[PDB]
Design a protein around this ligand. Structure first.
Ligand SMILES: *[C@@H]1O[C@H](CO)[C@@H](O[C@@H]2O[C@H](CO)[C@@H](O)[C@H](O)[C@H]2NC(C)=O)[C@H](O)[C@H]1NC(C)=O
Ligand SMILES: *[C@@H]1O[C@H](CO)[C@@H](O)[C@H](O)[C@H]1NC(C)=O
Lengths: 40, 49
């Protein structure tokens, strides 16, 4: 017996000051242990 | 004072990981945005409360 875990997912919320400050942004992957995100 | 904040990923609830479905869901237009909106507006007002 093999069990199926559905391939991981989440909301992506972008973190920004005003664009009238900078084009630099940070990004949050909601509820993700992101050791998997670079592997993707 | 509050309740457990929930975002329901509308298109993935309607049909998880099929574009054969997702391109049909797109014919219905705004509903799957206005749901995500609403649920996000309710989640945001928990922090308000
Ligand atoms: C993120 O996920 C990893 C698994 O990929 C978790 O790592 C395990 O952590 C426990 C406790 O340190 C160890 O006993 C396991 O051997 C670890 N496995 C690996 C592959 O490293 C990690 O704890 C998770 N962290 C969070 C905050 O979710
Ligand atoms: C952007 O912010 C600066 C102050 O940091 C301000 O002077 C300027 O008026 C703002 N931009 C616009 C388009 O109003």
């Amino acid at each position: 017996i093999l069990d199926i875990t559905p391939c991981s997912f989440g909301g992506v919320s972008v973190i920004t000051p005003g664009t009238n400050t900078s084009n630099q942004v940070a990004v949050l992957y909601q509820g993700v242990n992101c050791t998997e995100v670079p592997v993707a | 004072v509050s309740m457990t904040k929930t975002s329901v990923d509308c298109t993935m609830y309607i049909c998880g990981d099929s574009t054969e479905c997702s391109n049909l869901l797109l014919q219905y237009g705004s509903f799957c945005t206005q749901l995500n909106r609403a649920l996000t507006g309710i989640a945001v007002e928990q922090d308000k409360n």
